[PDB]
Amino acid sequence: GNAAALDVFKFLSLQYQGKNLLNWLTEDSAEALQALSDNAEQAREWRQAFIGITTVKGAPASHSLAKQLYFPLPGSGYHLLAPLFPTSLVHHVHALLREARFGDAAKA
RNA sequence: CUAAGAAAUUCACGGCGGGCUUGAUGUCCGCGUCUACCUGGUUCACUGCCGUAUAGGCAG
């Protein structure tokens, strides 16, 4: 996003990822009436942000500086392959640091 | 039909003054190297044999 992605990201991250349901399959799993149970007519005008908080745009696109390539199919024409940069895999391999290069158990 | 396809790093400059590395020392002691072979393979142009053109007396 922009340079304003430090606070709202940590605010949005914790509620969806990290729930604590492991113990029971029967007890306190059939609950649906433990809400606040308020009225629906009182908050009509200024609660306009329930639906637009998630829905970003789609439109699958590439760019003219985006590294596109042709790959020959067996006995046939081509598929145009547009590779992307793996952020998560480079981040996982950036745990080349603490366990291997100059973490504590390695330098010991 | 290629992580495709593109690209000017550049200008200038004082490294420098001085200096005690010393002193001493047991390398010794022993020893069986042997047998055989063809350089009879192409391993520098050493003063006294009348003329490239197809031509002329080599008791080397």
Determine if strand B comes within 7 Å of the CB of A68.
yes
Distance from C-alpha of A17 to C-alpha of A21, rounded to nearest angstrom: 12
Please, what is the end-to-end C-alpha distance for chain A in angstroms? Answer: 41
Helix (H) or strand (E) holding A104: helix A104-107
- CA A52 and chain centroid, separation: 17
Distance from C-alpha of A61 to C-alpha of A53, rounded to nearest angstrom: 23
Q: State the DSSP string of A95-108.
A: GGIIIIISSHHHH-
Minimum CA–C1' distance nucleotide for A71: B1
Query: At how many Å resolution was this determined?
Result: 2.6
> Considering only CA atoms, which of A95, A94, A99, A62 is closest in space to residue A81?
A62
> Considering only CA atoms, which of A55, A62, A60, A104 is closest in space to residue A83?
A62
Experimental method: cryo-EM
- Residue reference for tokens 């590439």: A62
Give the list of residues 6+ apart from residue A21 with CB closer than 8 angstroms, or none. none
